[PDB]
C-alpha cells in the first residue's frame, strides 16, 4: 500500500532493478560466477582504478611489454572477466584503459544501488526504497507550463547528427536531493546559471540521486577526458541522451536537468588538460560548431534555459560539433528535473 504517484513508483522500480544490474555486468563480460553482484567491493574497485593508472603511466613511459602485461593481468584478477572465445584485451593503450575506467565508474554506482537496496519493517515496498534515495521526487503535471518549457527544450535541441532515434518525454519529475540546496547556496551568487542536460545509464541513478553527480576519483586514470575530471553537461539533449546507452531491448532512459552555476566560463575549442582553472574562471565551455539559437534563450527563476534550435555558432576550428560544459566542484550543481524518455529508434 504505497502512497507515491505511480510514475514515481515506476521510477523507483527501474532504478533499483536487480536484473538490470546483473545484465549490465554481463554486458561488461564480467564473470558473475567469480564476482557476483553481491560481492562488488568499493575497495576492490578502488584498487582496480589504481592499477589502470599504473597501466596508463606505463603506456606513456614506454615500459616493457612484460611489465604492462603483468599490470593488465593484475587488473583482470581484481575484476574477473569471461570472454568466451576471444582473449581479454591487453590493457596497453588509452582506449582500452578508458573503456575499463568507464566500466569501473558504472560498477561503483551499481555497488551503491545494490548495497542501498540490501540495507536497513512495515512500510510499502516502493516507499522504503524511495526513502533510501534521500531525494524528494514529485511528478510535474503534464498540463503545466513547466512541462511545456521542458518539452520544447527536448524537442528543439536534438542534434541533426544524432539521427539514430527520436525522443518523447514520458514523465517529468522535479527532484530535490537532501542537502543539495544548502551545498549549492554559495554558488547561487555566481553569475551565468544555466539549466543543462546530463545523461547517464539507468543503473547509475540510485547513486546519482543519493550522492549527486560526482567527479571521477583521483585513483582513476587521467586519460580519456576532453576537459579533465569534472562534471559534464550539454545544451543539446541528444548529446546527453547518447550517454544513457539505451537500446531497442531497453529503449527507456533517464536524463537530468541540472542548474549549473557556470560563472565566467573558460571557453575552449580543443582538448585542454588542466583540471585546474584560471583565476576568475569557474567552468569550462567547450565550443561546438552548432549552438542553440541565442535569441530563443529564456530566463526562468534567474536561470538561463537555452531551448533554441541548433544554429551555426560561427566557431571554426573546434574539435566539437556541439557545446559542452564542465565544472570541477560538485557543489556547483543543483539537480532540478529527472526526465523519463522514450527512445524511438530508426
By CB under 6 A, is residue 199 in contact with ligand 8E3?
A: yes
CB-based contact 116:313 (threshold 8 Å): no
* Distance from chain centroid for Cα 323: 16
Residues classed as catalytic: 324
Using left for φ > 0, alpha for ψ between -120 and 50, and beta otherwise, residue 187 falls in: alpha
Q: Is 183 annotated as a binding residue?
A: no
By CB under 6 A, is residue 240 in contact with ligand 8E3?
A: yes
By CB under 6 A, is residue 232 in contact with ligand 8E3?
A: yes
- Closest CB to ligand 8E3 among residues 4, 99: 99
By CB under 6 A, is residue 70 in contact with ligand 8E3?
A: no
H helical segments located in the chain: 6-15, 18-27, 42-61, 65-78, 94-117, 125-132, 145-156, 180-184, 205-211, 237-241
Q: How far is 136 from 69, CA to CA, in rounded Å?
A: 48
By CB under 6 A, is residue 28 in contact with ligand 8E3?
A: no
Q: What separation in angstroms does the CA of 114 have from each of 16, 66, 216, 245?
A: 7, 37, 20, 20
By CB under 6 A, is residue 324 in contact with ligand 8E3?
A: yes
Q: How far is 248 from 265, CA to CA, in rounded Å?
A: 37
Residues 85-124 that bind ligand 8E3 (CB under 6 A): 98, 102
- Closest CB to ligand 8E3 among residues 230, 263: 230
Q: What separation in angstroms does the CA of 21 have from each of 152, 169, 343?
A: 33, 24, 20
User: Residue from 187, 225, 266, 328 that binds ligand 8E3 (CB under 6 A)?
Assistant: 225
Q: How far is 26 from 336, CA to CA, in rounded Å?
A: 32
User: Residue from 21, 58, 169, 234 that binds ligand 8E3 (CB under 6 A)?
Assistant: 234
Q: Is 207 annotated as a binding residue?
A: yes
By CB under 6 A, is residue 261 in contact with ligand 8E3?
A: no
User: Residue from 44, 243, 269, 275 that binds ligand 8E3 (CB under 6 A)?
Assistant: 243
Q: Which residues are known binding-site members for NAD(+)?
A: 198-200, 207, 214, 240
Q: Under the rule (CB under 6 A), what is the footprint of ligand 8E3?
A: 98, 102, 197-200, 224-225, 232-234, 239-240, 243, 324
Amino acid at each position: 500500500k504505497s502512497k507515491l504517484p505511480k510514475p514515481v513508483q515506476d521510477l523507483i522500480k527501474m532504478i533499483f532493478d536487480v536484473e538490470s544490474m546483473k545484465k549490465a555486468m554481463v554486458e561488461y563480460e564480467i564473470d558473475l560466477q567469480k564476482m557476483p553482484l553481491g560481492k562488488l567491493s568499493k575497495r576492490q574497485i578502488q584498487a582496480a582504478y589504481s592499477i589502470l593508472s599504473e597501466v596508463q603511466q606505463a603506456v606513456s613511459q614506454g615500459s616493457s611489454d612484460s611489465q604492462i602485461l603483468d599490470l593488465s593481468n593484475r587488473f583482470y584478477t581484481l575484476i574477473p572477466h569471461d570472454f568466451g572465445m576471444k582473449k581479454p584485451p591487453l590493457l596497453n593503450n588509452a582506449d582500452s584503459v578508458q573503456a575499463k575506467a568507464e566500466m569501473l565508474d558504472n560498477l561503483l554506482d551499481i555497488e551503491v544501488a545494490y548495497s542501498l537496496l540490501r540495507g536497513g519493517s512495515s512500510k510499502d515496498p516502493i516507499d522504503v526504497n524511495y526513502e533510501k534515495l534521500k531525494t524528494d521526487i514529485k511528478v510535474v503535471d503534464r498540463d503545466s507550463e513547466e512541462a511545456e518549457i521542458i518539452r520544447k527544450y527536448v524537442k528543439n535541441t536534438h542534434a541533426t547528427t544524432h539521427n539514430a532515434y527520436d525522443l518523447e518525454v514520458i514523465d517529468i519529475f522535479k527532484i530535490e536531493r537532501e542537502g543539495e540546496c544548502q551545498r549549492y547556496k554559495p554558488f547561487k551568487q555566481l553569475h551565468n546559471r544555466r539549466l543543462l542536460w546530463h545523461g547517464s545509464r539507468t543503473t547509475n541513478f540510485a547513486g546519482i540521486l543519493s550522492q549527486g553527480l560526482r567527479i571521477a576519483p583521483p585513483e582513476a586514470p587521467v586519460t580519456g577526458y576532453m576537459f579533465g575530471k569534472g562534471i559534464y553537461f550539454a545544451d543539446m539533449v541528444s548529446k546527453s541522451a547518447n550517454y544513457c546507452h539505451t537500446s531497442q531491448g531497453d529503449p527507456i532512459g533517464l536524463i537530468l536537468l541540472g542548474e549549473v552555476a557556470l560563472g565566467n566560463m573558460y571557453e575552449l575549442k580543443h582538448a585542454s588538460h588542466i583540471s585546474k582553472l584560471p583565476k576568475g574562471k569557474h567552468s569550462v565551455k567547450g565550443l561546438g560548431k552548432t549552438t542553440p539559437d541565442p535569441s530563443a534563450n529564456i530566463s526562468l527563476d534567474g536561470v538561463d534555459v537555452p531551448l533554441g534550435t541548433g544554429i551555426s555558432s560561427g566557431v571554426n576550428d573546434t574539435s566539437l560539433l556541439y557545446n559542452e560544459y564542465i565544472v570541477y566542484d560538485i557543489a556547483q550543481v543543483n539537480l532540478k528535473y529527472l526526465l523519463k524518455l522514450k527512445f524511438n529508434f530508426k
